[PDB]
């Protein structure tokens, strides 16, 4: 959610746009359900977050 | 006392116990020395009015 603030910096929504968002690009690329990695051996270190 | 409610009987005892700050003079001064953690961060908070 990004009308809610970030904790660790409780100033600002996200510091990452990109990142942050449901659905935009470091979801998309990274994240455990979509799989663009998953089939490659090679570990993802961003599979972690 | 005894509760019959089921549970036990579970009933307090009770100790009562008076006292008096003791001496003319200042007696037992504390001293505060070190710092933990704030519980409040210095933060970013604005005020709305």
């Known amino acids: 959610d990004h009308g809610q603030s970030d904790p660790a910096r409780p100033f600002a929504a996200t510091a990452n746009p990109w990142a942050s968002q449901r659905f935009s690009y470091g979801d998309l690329l990274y994240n455990g359900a979509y799989h663009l990695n998953g089939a490659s051996p090679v570990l993802s270190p961003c599979f972690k977050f | ?49």
């Not at chain 2, 549970?7 to 001064?29: E, K």
Request: no cysteine.
């Open chain 2, 1 to 49: 006392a005894r509760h019959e409610t089921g549970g036990g009987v579970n009933f307090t005892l009770t100790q009562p116990r008076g006292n008096v700050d003791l001496g003319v003079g200042y007696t037992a001064v504390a001293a505060t020395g070190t710092v933990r953690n704030p519980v409040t961060d210095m933060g970013n908070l604005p005020q709305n009015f």
